[PDB]
């Protein structure tokens with residue numbers, strides 16, 4: 001689990017959104033596994049606006065942050081799970097690193113701020129849903 005809190009927005013994995021996130025929906029895209037809902041309080045996360053390919057991610061199944069190299073956002077085939085059938089997920093970045101299903105939501109950050117959140121993984125990989133192209137999170 002986990003979210004990004006920027007301005008009056010809450011960014012979560014769409015598969016982990018609550019009934020309240022849907023009532024307060026701003027934008028969602030199943031093909032990206034993202035959902036953004038509105039908040040009453042102002043958030044303090046800064047979103048990165050960059051092309052960094054190295055950063056640090058939080059892994060809740062190890063209670064540890066790991067430095068990683070990751071691929072640029074792209075269309076990647078993601079195996080079936082209890083939340084989606086097998087499909088291509090867009091804006092996805094992959095890295096070699098530990099991840100378990102409950103690690104979705106962990107932040108990936110670079111020197112510029114938040115890059116994205118854990119969204120896919122397995123077999124020694126970890127995938128992150130990019131948020132750096134969502135310029136409107138800033139206004």
Ligand SMILES: CSc1ccccc1NC(=O)N1CC[C@H](C(N)=O)C1
Nearest residue numbers: 033081083099100101119120121122
């Ligand atoms: C860190 S996710 C993970 C880790 C180990 C094994 C499997 C996984 N995958 C998942 O449980 N999911 C749930 C839906 C998510 C998606 N974006 O399609 C993929």
Ligand SMILES: [Zn+2]
Nearest residue numbers: 050052110112
């Ligand atoms: Zn950066």
